[PDB]
């Protein structure tokens, strides 16, 4: 969980004072202390009744309301983004709709990406939960 860096102890330029520390940009460029980051988002469908359930689906503007301010143009027809796609902040990675109880009768419950993070989708998993409703896990990847 570390790397053997070559360290000098010197008052070189004054940028390492009070527990600061100068690092070689070239060594960073060659891969020193470089790390991968994986974030996984989760979501599933709930059952609010008999025939009232949620659905993974790309929410069209006409039948849906209160759509997030991110872009939906990355979801496939199943409401899921595909692995291998570049994703920015505020982008939707799991589209989901919750029906409106008693056209234009649906609200969205989509999961956007965190407003700070960039990265690349790595592994979009799809299964069913304890109660047999559809279950999705999406692992993102990035490099820091």
């Amino acid at each position: 969980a570390g790397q053997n860096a070559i360290v000098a102890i010197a008052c070189y330029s004054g940028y390492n004072q009070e527990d600061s520390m100068i690092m070689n940009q070239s060594s960073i460029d060659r891969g020193l202390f470089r790390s991968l980051f994986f974030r996984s988002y989760m979501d599933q469908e709930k059952r609010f009744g008999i025939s009232i359930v949620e659905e993974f689906e790309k929410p069209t503007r006409a039948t849906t309301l209160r759509l997030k301010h991110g872009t939906y143009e990355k979801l496939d027809e199943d409401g899921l983004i595909a692995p291998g796609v570049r994703v920015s902040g505020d982008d939707i990675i799991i589209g989901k709709t919750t029906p409106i109880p008693p056209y234009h009768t649906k609200r969205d419950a989509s999961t956007p990406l965190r407003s700070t993070e960039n990265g690349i989708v790595d592994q979009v998993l799809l299964t069913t939960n304890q109660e047999g409703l559809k279950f999705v896990k999406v692992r993102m990847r990035t490099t820091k």
Partner: protein, 97 residues
């Protein structure tokens, strides 16, 4: 936010009036805040993880208040012990010796 705007700059805990002082802005890349090294003593700060807060005055009265009462040059001498609180530190002292 632009160069030379007065902003109130602050580290917790704010034990005395010189823990929160008004600084002039200089815009830079590389997402950390930059401080001249002689003001790290009144803040009791160092550069091993610390974070500090920045408050932007939203009117001219508060700009003038910051620049004429809270500015860093005005707090060099403290009333706590009628002596300076900012000095030469930590490599400039060794080098000047």
């Amino acid at each position: 936010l632009m160069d030379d705007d007065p902003v109130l700059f602050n580290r917790q805990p704010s034990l005395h009036k010189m823990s929160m002082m008004a600084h002039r802005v200089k815009v830079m890349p590389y997402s950390t805040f930059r401080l001249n090294l002689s003001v790290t003593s009144p803040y009791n700060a160092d550069f091993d993880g610390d974070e500090m807060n920045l408050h932007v005055p939203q009117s001219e009265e508060t700009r003038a208040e910051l620049s004429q009462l809270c500015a860093v040059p005005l707090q060099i001498v403290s009333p706590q012990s009628n002596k300076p609180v900012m000095g030469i530190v930590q490599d400039t002292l060794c080098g000047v010796r």
